[PDB]
Amino acid sequence: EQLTKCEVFRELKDLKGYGGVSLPEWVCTTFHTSGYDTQAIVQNNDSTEYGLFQINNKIWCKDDQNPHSSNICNISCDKFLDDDLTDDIMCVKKILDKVGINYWLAHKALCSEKLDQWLCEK
Ligand SMILES: [Ca+2]
Ligand SMILES: [K+]
């Protein structure tokens, strides 16, 4: 589904403060990672990134292109293409505990300033 700014804000609530990443940062970073599309798939050769968070199948989750992934998150990648972002968040929380916010490249380029464009009021 195609989510909006504030939908994302609501829905990423359990991520608020985890890793010292605020909700506004994540709204921005998700926007600039998947365009708020929960079914977004990016792939090459090679590797494929899945969902709101563009969680990859090289080390994070398993799929048919890389069934031999380390599968850190202990899950099928395609669980990251439905609307329940509960499992997506638990995996992002693991990406954060081991490689940090810079897995998401949009964070530093696009979401390191003008965080006022990413607020949801009331
Ligand atoms: Ca999911
Ligand atoms: K979109």
Swiss-Prot record:
The keyword NAD does not apply. It comes from the Eukaryota. Ca(2+) binds at K79, D82, D84, D87, D88. One of its GO terms (biological process) is response to progesterone. The keyword Oxidoreductase does not apply. One of its GO terms (molecular function) is lysozyme activity. Disulfide bonds join C6-C120, C28-C111, C61-C77, C73-C91. Keywords: Allergen, Calcium, Disulfide bond, Glycoprotein, Lactose biosynthesis, Metal-binding, Milk protein, Secreted, Signal. It is found in: Secreted. Mammary gland specific. Secreted in milk. Gene3D superfamilies: 1.10.530.10. InterPro entries: Glyco_hydro_22, Glyco_hydro_22_CS, Lactalbumin, Lysozyme-like_dom_sf. Glycans are attached at N45. GO terms for cellular component: extracellular space. Residues 1-122 form the C-type lysozyme domain. Its main location: secreted. It holds the Pfam family Lys. Lactose synthase (LS) is a heterodimer of a catalytic component, beta1,4-galactosyltransferase (beta4Gal-T1) and a regulatory component, alpha-lactalbumin (LA). Belongs to the glycosyl hydrolase 22 family. Regulatory subunit of lactose synthase, changes the substrate specificity of galactosyltransferase in the mammary gland making glucose a good acceptor substrate for this enzyme. This enables LS to synthesize lactose, the major carbohydrate component of milk. In other tissues, galactosyltransferase transfers galactose onto the N-acetylglucosamine of the oligosaccharide chains in glycoproteins. This is Alpha-lactalbumin. It comes from Bos taurus (Bovine).
